[PDB]
């Protein structure tokens, strides 16, 4: 119905470019429309789509269709059973440059991360991130150039900056966490307290009146 | 009389009730059974004694602070001195009991390097606490024993642990505080904190999905100490 | 140790937050048999408030866990045993202060101000015994609490101003006794209201009294919800 309407829209607009991704995830959690949209994005359209989202430009017909196919895919997916660690490198700054440590912010575009640490850090790259989340979509069975094993996070996904630091080379080294995980996430139960870290963590009118 | 399961539950109850002397006694008895502690049991033992020793370190600092500010009175000075020495005596017994558990059971029974570093770090910590109240010859003994335990822990951590491991990072923090506060070496403190920080930020891809926030928190403490100690 | 040494030791123990030491020092001062100064009385009161307070808090936590557990009989026996251990300590603390009150503090009190203070204190520690007591013993501690509070209230209404902080503190603790121990919100609100009304009628520079008056008013609005 709605899936078929969007799937047809993608084939009418991108032809064989959309259709090469058909059936690439036989563990069919996602519709044909979603698998083609995730493929079109992962393979090449990420650059033009994310540029338009980030700049606040109106999306053309093709971009509109890819964006609704990806939104629908995230709606069906939800949170995974375990926290996944992924990596991301950019030649310059990103949307989290502005976000201070311990505070949350988000990228207006979709957030591509990789399970492969290599196809991320460090030569040429200006900001290197380690991401922890549950709501990412694994697209490695749809599109996998350079065997990047990509995990995509939804556009405008709120991320907490757990750490923002700079290398002695000038490389920004960041740790991001999906805000929706919680604040008790990433803590091994009682270890910080047990580590006995060397760092500092009635009223007054009687006193001798024991007021209940 | 009491089995391991009973003493572990008693310790968890004592913790909630903020009855740390009870928590420490229960975990001391568990340790003296001679078997290697689980991570939960180890953390229970560590939290118990951290609070038991912590209260005396805090009290010692307060009575020491008062001793300086108090007026020129032979009787008043003698009361303050006596009271500080009473706290010192308690602190020594606490540190001696945990150092006894560490030498007799905790360090020799540690089979994984994670636990070995944890307990050797702990040995450094309690000798550091003895150093804070010690003077003369005894101070030189407790100060050397602290550095030796921290160094042995540091050696194993660099060979067997990732630079982001919270146990390795917590050790780097406490050992750098030892150099800064006990050896009065801002240079040695900064050198250690900088190397640990640099090595951890170079390999953030080694962050464990279970303890990543423990790591980032200690990394922040390291960086904050470095910027504070390298002021102006 | 001399009185002067014991009082200084108690002031040192307080700063160091070593309340067991503070209580032992002030217990020894009291056992010398002379009427305590307002400073000494307040030192004794703060010492035991913290010593008993820690056990009241621990008891409430272990009692709360006992109800929420109810899964393993071995776990149930540990909780029961541990709560009874805390109870036995609480009973020892209260018995020591009630011993000081009956043997020295109440018989040596020469001014009504102090007489009210110590009888109020007697009511407080019998109230603490009542919180953990059961059956016959509970009935004895509950009666002794009411009797001490009533005895203090009679002297406070005849010899003290309605705004006196000792009189107001008594009205607060006695109303809490009616509410928590006798489960009588009516008796609780009647006492708290009369004390508040009597104090606001005769206010004519004390933020002291005003703070306790606020606690009484806050309880009245909370209980008449």
Residue numbers in the entry:
A (entry chain C): 232 to 432, 443 to 453
B (entry chain A): 2 to 233
C (entry chain B): 3 to 206, 212 to 232
Question: What's written in the study?
Answer:
Using immobilized metal ion chromatography we isolated hexahistidine-tagged ADP-ribosyltransferase domains of either toxin—ExoS233-453(E379A,E381A) and ExoT235-435(wt)—in complex with untagged 14-3-3β. A protein complex with an apparent molecular weight of roughly 83.5 kDa (indicative of a heterotrimer: an ExoSE379A,E381A monomer bound to a 14-3-3β dimer; expected molecular weight 83246 Da) readily crystallized under various conditions. We solved the structure using molecular replacement with 14-3-3β and Vis toxin (PDB entries 2C2321 and 4XZJ29) as search models. Numbers in italics indicate the ExoS residues that were resolved in the electron density. f Detail of the electron density around carba-NAD in the active site of ExoS (2Fobs –  Fcalc electron density map contoured at 1σ (0.1073 eÅ−3)). g Comparison of the ExoS apo and carba-NAD structures. The loop containing F354 is in two different conformations, where the open conformation from the apo structure is marked with an asterisk. In all our protein complex structures, the phosphoprotein-binding site of the exotoxin bound 14-3-3β protomer was occupied by an amphipathic peptide containing the LDLA-box in a short α-helical segment (ExoS residues 420QGLLDALDLAS430) in which the D427 side chain hydrogen bonded with the 14-3-3β Y127 and Y130 side chains, and the hydrophobic side chains formed hydrophobic interactions within the amphipathic groove of 14-3-3β. LDLA-box 2 bound in a configuration that was highly similar to the configuration of LDLA-box 1 in all four structures.
Two of these, exotoxins-S and -T (ExoS; ExoT), are homologous enzymes consisting of an N-terminal GTPase-activating protein (GAP) domain (73% identity; 81% similarity) and a C-terminal ADP-ribosyltransferase (ART) domain (78% identity; 87% similarity). The ADP-ribosyltransferase activity of ExoS and ExoT and their cellular toxicity are dependent upon association of the ART domains with 14-3-3 proteins.
